[PDB]
Short mmCIF file of C-alpha atoms in Angstrom, two decimals:
data_model
loop_
_atom_site.label_atom_id
_atom_site.label_comp_id
_atom_site.label_asym_id
_atom_site.label_seq_id
_atom_site.Cartn_x
_atom_site.Cartn_y
_atom_site.Cartn_z
CA UNK S 1 -297.00 54.15 -40.31
CA UNK S 2 -293.54 54.45 -41.85
CA UNK S 3 -290.66 52.39 -40.46
CA UNK S 4 -288.53 55.49 -39.86
CA UNK S 5 -291.21 56.91 -37.54
CA UNK S 6 -291.26 53.74 -35.43
CA UNK S 7 -287.46 53.69 -35.37
CA UNK S 8 -287.23 57.31 -34.17
CA UNK S 9 -289.92 56.73 -31.54
CA UNK S 10 -288.17 53.57 -30.31
CA UNK S 11 -284.87 55.48 -30.20
CA UNK S 12 -286.47 58.16 -28.02
CA UNK S 13 -288.05 55.53 -25.76
CA UNK S 14 -284.79 53.58 -25.40
CA UNK S 15 -282.86 56.78 -24.69
CA UNK S 16 -285.21 57.39 -21.74
CA UNK S 17 -284.28 54.04 -20.16
CA UNK S 18 -280.80 54.85 -18.83
CA UNK S 19 -278.16 57.57 -18.72
CA UNK S 20 -275.99 55.73 -21.28
CA UNK S 21 -278.94 55.38 -23.66
CA UNK S 22 -279.68 59.08 -23.20
CA UNK S 23 -276.06 59.90 -24.05
CA UNK S 24 -276.37 57.85 -27.26
CA UNK S 25 -279.95 58.90 -28.17
CA UNK S 26 -278.86 61.82 -30.37
CA UNK S 27 -276.34 59.65 -32.23
CA UNK S 28 -279.04 57.04 -32.88
CA UNK S 29 -281.45 59.72 -34.10
CA UNK S 30 -278.78 61.00 -36.48
CA UNK S 31 -278.15 57.48 -37.79
CA UNK S 32 -281.85 56.95 -38.47
CA UNK S 33 -282.32 60.36 -40.11
CA UNK S 34 -279.23 60.06 -42.32
CA UNK S 35 -280.19 56.53 -43.36
CA UNK S 36 -283.53 58.02 -44.41
CA UNK S 37 -281.89 61.11 -45.99
CA UNK S 38 -284.02 63.27 -43.68
CA UNK S 39 -281.20 65.77 -43.05
CA UNK S 40 -280.78 68.72 -43.11
CA UNK S 41 -284.59 69.05 -43.15
CA UNK S 42 -284.88 67.44 -39.71
CA UNK S 43 -282.03 69.35 -38.02
CA UNK S 44 -284.41 70.97 -35.53
CA UNK S 45 -285.59 67.56 -34.33
CA UNK S 46 -281.97 66.52 -33.74
CA UNK S 47 -281.22 69.70 -31.77
CA UNK S 48 -284.30 69.15 -29.62
CA UNK S 49 -283.24 65.53 -29.13
CA UNK S 50 -279.81 66.59 -27.86
CA UNK S 51 -281.34 69.04 -25.38
CA UNK S 52 -283.98 66.49 -24.35
CA UNK S 53 -281.17 63.99 -23.79
CA UNK S 54 -279.52 66.37 -21.34
CA UNK S 55 -282.82 66.90 -19.53
CA UNK S 56 -283.46 63.14 -19.38
CA UNK S 57 -279.97 62.46 -18.03
CA UNK S 58 -280.49 64.84 -15.13
CA UNK S 59 -284.01 63.48 -14.54
CA UNK S 60 -282.78 59.88 -14.44
CA UNK S 61 -279.84 60.70 -12.17
CA UNK S 62 -281.95 62.66 -9.68
CA UNK S 63 -284.84 60.15 -9.66
CA UNK S 64 -282.69 57.02 -9.37
CA UNK S 65 -280.78 58.47 -6.41
CA UNK S 66 -283.56 58.47 -3.81
CA UNK S 67 -283.17 61.04 -1.03
CA UNK S 68 -283.39 59.40 2.40
CA UNK S 69 -282.87 62.48 4.57
CA UNK S 70 -284.93 63.44 7.61
CA UNK S 71 -287.92 65.43 6.33
CA UNK S 72 -289.79 66.26 9.56
CA UNK S 73 -287.30 64.63 12.02
CA UNK S 74 -285.34 67.40 13.72
CA UNK S 75 -284.78 67.93 17.47
CA UNK S 76 -280.97 67.99 17.67
CA UNK S 77 -280.78 67.74 13.88
CA UNK S 78 -277.72 69.96 13.40
CA UNK S 79 -275.16 68.29 15.66
CA UNK S 80 -276.20 64.72 14.82
CA UNK S 81 -275.80 65.31 11.08
CA UNK S 82 -272.48 67.07 11.68
CA UNK S 83 -271.19 64.09 13.70
CA UNK S 84 -272.35 61.58 11.08
CA UNK S 85 -270.47 63.71 8.55
CA UNK S 86 -267.30 63.75 10.65
CA UNK S 87 -267.62 59.95 10.46
CA UNK S 88 -268.29 59.88 6.70
CA UNK S 89 -265.17 62.04 6.36
CA UNK S 90 -262.92 59.41 7.88
CA UNK S 91 -264.52 56.55 5.95
CA UNK S 92 -263.80 58.42 2.69
CA UNK S 93 -261.71 55.72 1.01
CA UNK S 94 -263.30 54.07 -1.99
CA UNK S 95 -264.80 57.26 -3.42
CA UNK S 96 -264.42 57.63 -7.20
CA UNK S 97 -262.70 60.52 -8.93
CA UNK S 98 -264.30 63.34 -10.93
CA UNK S 99 -267.07 63.84 -8.40
CA UNK S 100 -269.79 66.26 -9.47
CA UNK S 101 -272.95 67.52 -7.79
CA UNK S 102 -275.71 68.78 -10.07
CA UNK S 103 -278.32 70.75 -8.11
CA UNK S 104 -281.38 72.69 -9.30
CA UNK S 105 -283.48 75.04 -7.16
CA UNK S 106 -286.83 76.08 -8.58
CA UNK S 107 -288.63 79.37 -8.09
CA UNK S 108 -291.07 77.44 -5.86
CA UNK S 109 -288.12 76.12 -3.75
CA UNK S 110 -288.29 72.64 -5.33
CA UNK S 111 -284.86 71.01 -5.23
CA UNK S 112 -283.31 68.28 -7.38
CA UNK S 113 -279.87 66.75 -6.82
CA UNK S 114 -277.67 64.27 -8.64
CA UNK S 115 -274.23 62.90 -7.73
CA UNK S 116 -272.10 61.77 -10.66
CA UNK S 117 -268.58 60.41 -11.17
CA UNK S 118 -267.00 61.10 -14.58
CA UNK S 119 -270.50 61.16 -16.02
CA UNK S 120 -271.59 57.99 -14.21
CA UNK S 121 -274.24 57.61 -11.52
CA UNK S 122 -272.88 57.27 -7.99
CA UNK S 123 -274.53 54.36 -6.17
CA UNK S 124 -274.33 52.38 -2.96
CA UNK S 125 -272.36 53.42 0.10
CA UNK S 126 -270.52 55.99 -2.03
CA UNK S 127 -273.87 57.67 -2.66
CA UNK S 128 -274.69 57.29 1.03
CA UNK S 129 -271.51 59.18 1.93
CA UNK S 130 -272.21 61.96 -0.57
CA UNK S 131 -275.84 62.35 0.55
CA UNK S 132 -274.83 62.34 4.21
CA UNK S 133 -272.31 65.11 3.53
CA UNK S 134 -274.98 67.11 1.70
CA UNK S 135 -277.38 66.61 4.62
CA UNK S 136 -274.60 67.82 6.91
CA UNK S 137 -274.12 70.97 4.84
CA UNK S 138 -277.90 71.49 4.89
CA UNK S 139 -278.07 71.12 8.67
CA UNK S 140 -275.12 73.48 9.17
CA UNK S 141 -277.09 76.11 7.23
CA UNK S 142 -280.35 75.24 9.04
CA UNK S 143 -281.86 73.70 5.91
CA UNK S 144 -283.81 70.54 5.17
CA UNK S 145 -285.40 68.80 2.19
CA UNK S 146 -289.11 68.26 2.86
CA UNK S 147 -291.74 67.53 0.24
CA UNK S 148 -289.10 67.82 -2.47
CA UNK S 149 -288.44 71.42 -1.41
CA UNK S 150 -285.78 73.31 0.52
CA UNK S 151 -287.11 74.56 3.85
CA UNK S 152 -285.63 76.43 6.79
CA UNK S 153 -285.80 74.63 10.14
CA UNK S 154 -285.87 76.37 13.49
CA UNK S 155 -284.17 74.90 16.58
CA UNK S 156 -287.44 73.34 17.79
CA UNK S 157 -288.10 72.04 14.27
CA UNK S 158 -290.49 74.61 12.76
CA UNK S 159 -290.60 74.47 8.95
CA UNK S 160 -290.52 77.82 7.14
CA UNK S 161 -290.36 78.62 3.43
CA UNK S 162 -287.00 79.59 1.93
CA UNK S 163 -285.97 82.04 -0.78
CA UNK S 164 -284.76 80.25 -3.95
CA UNK S 165 -282.20 82.84 -5.11
CA UNK S 166 -280.79 83.03 -1.58
CA UNK S 167 -280.17 79.27 -1.57
CA UNK S 168 -278.83 79.35 -5.13
CA UNK S 169 -276.18 81.88 -4.13
CA UNK S 170 -275.54 80.05 -0.84
CA UNK S 171 -274.70 76.85 -2.74
CA UNK S 172 -272.04 78.59 -4.85
CA UNK S 173 -270.53 80.61 -1.97
CA UNK S 174 -266.78 80.28 -1.51
CA UNK S 175 -267.06 80.19 2.30
CA UNK S 176 -270.54 78.78 3.00
CA UNK S 177 -270.96 76.70 -0.17
CA UNK S 178 -271.39 73.00 -0.80
CA UNK S 179 -267.99 72.61 -2.50
CA UNK S 180 -266.19 74.24 0.44
CA UNK S 181 -268.04 72.05 2.96
CA UNK S 182 -267.09 68.91 1.03
CA UNK S 183 -263.47 70.01 0.64
CA UNK S 184 -263.13 70.71 4.38
CA UNK S 185 -264.62 67.23 4.88
CA UNK S 186 -261.84 65.77 2.72
CA UNK S 187 -263.82 65.44 -0.54
CA UNK S 188 -262.75 67.10 -3.77
CA UNK S 189 -265.79 67.78 -5.92
CA UNK S 190 -267.41 70.15 -8.41
CA UNK S 191 -270.79 71.84 -7.95
CA UNK S 192 -272.70 72.64 -11.15
CA UNK S 193 -276.04 74.37 -10.64
CA UNK S 194 -278.62 73.85 -13.37
CA UNK S 195 -282.03 75.32 -14.11
CA UNK S 196 -284.94 73.62 -12.36
CA UNK S 197 -287.27 71.91 -14.83
CA UNK S 198 -290.82 71.26 -13.70
CA UNK S 199 -292.45 68.04 -15.01
CA UNK S 200 -294.71 69.93 -17.43
CA UNK S 201 -291.69 71.52 -19.15
CA UNK S 202 -290.11 68.13 -19.85
CA UNK S 203 -293.49 66.86 -21.03
CA UNK S 204 -293.74 69.79 -23.45
CA UNK S 205 -290.24 69.12 -24.82
CA UNK S 206 -291.05 65.44 -25.31
CA UNK S 207 -294.37 66.30 -26.96
CA UNK S 208 -292.60 68.64 -29.39
CA UNK S 209 -290.21 65.87 -30.43
CA UNK S 210 -292.96 63.25 -30.66
CA UNK S 211 -295.21 65.47 -32.77
CA UNK S 212 -292.33 66.19 -35.13
CA UNK S 213 -291.74 62.43 -35.43
CA UNK S 214 -295.44 61.74 -36.13
CA UNK S 215 -295.58 64.58 -38.69
#
């Protein structure tokens, strides 16, 4: 049980606590490795730590921002969401700059979303406005988030499965996309689609790093 191993493991654990700690995790790993003269032999561990930090940042942002949209509730789901969004689009003051939406659609239709401002988590009523606008865009395209997945909703409220690549290209569309919907609602923003990462993939990445630390 060498002290460097405990330090690296604590650095990984601390980096998983918050987005700021994840942004600084790779720097801390480099400090520990250089202080132990473990570079350039441990360069691969540092590269994996940087990539893991990016994965952890998106995981923390998506998880912390809890989705409160109507899963099963439908009926007149389209018009009600559109009206709530026409309201959210007047009460737009007090929204930060550099707004970014990170969205991942898996091959199994699983969806993850994160709203960020200049690299910082959007919280509170600001987050409520952004999520309401996203729910409005979803309703306009007859879409809902149920069970952590994107589903198509019929007028009566029937839930059907959706095609992932179709939704991926719909998000980035110039006319029917999220960015256009937000802009027409008075919100300047950037949409950055990222690859969906299932839990087991993140667990494998973490296990790789941990095994290299314990080696």
